[PDB]
Design brief:
18 copies of one chain form a homo-oligomer. With 11 residues, the first copy, chain A, is mainly β. Chain A has no helices and one strand. The first copy, chain A, is rod-shaped. Chains A, B, C, D, E, F, G, H, I, J, K, L, M, N, O, P, Q, R: This is Islet amyloid polypeptide.
Chain lengths: 11, 11, 11, 11, 11, 11, 11, 11, 11, 11, 11, 11, 11, 11, 11, 11, 11, 11
């Protein structure tokens, strides 16, 4: 498989 | 498999 | 302050 | 301050 | 201050 | 201050 | 101050 | 398998 | 001060 | 297998 | 001061 | 197997 | 002061 | 097997 | 002062 | 087998 | 087998 | 077998 991406940014 | 990515940034 | 919530679920 | 929450689950 | 929580689960 | 919590579980 | 907690579990 | 990545940053 | 806790378990 | 990575930074 | 705790278990 | 990495930094 | 605790178990 | 790494830093 | 404890067990 | 590493630093 | 390493530093 | 290492430093 390839790429699984999750990001959460809280300022 | 490839890449699994999870990041959480809290400022 | 109150609640800051971040979750990442990868199945 | 209150609650700061970060969780990352990778199955 | 209150609660700061970080958990990372990798199965 | 209160609670600072960090856990990392790798199965 | 209160509680500072860090745990790392590797199975 | 490849790469599994999890990071949590709390400032 | 209170409690400072660090544990590392490797099975 | 490859790389499994978990980091938690609390400032 | 209170409690400072460090344990490392390697099975 | 490869690399399993866990770090927790509390400043 | 209170309690300072360090243990290392290697099976 | 390869590398299993766990570190906990508390400043 | 109180208690300072260090133990190392190698089986 | 290779390397198993555990360190706990408390300043 | 290789290397098994455990260190605990308390300043 | 190789190396088994355990150290505890309390300043």
């Amino acid at each position: 498989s390839g790429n699984n991406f999750g990001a959460i940014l809280s300022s």
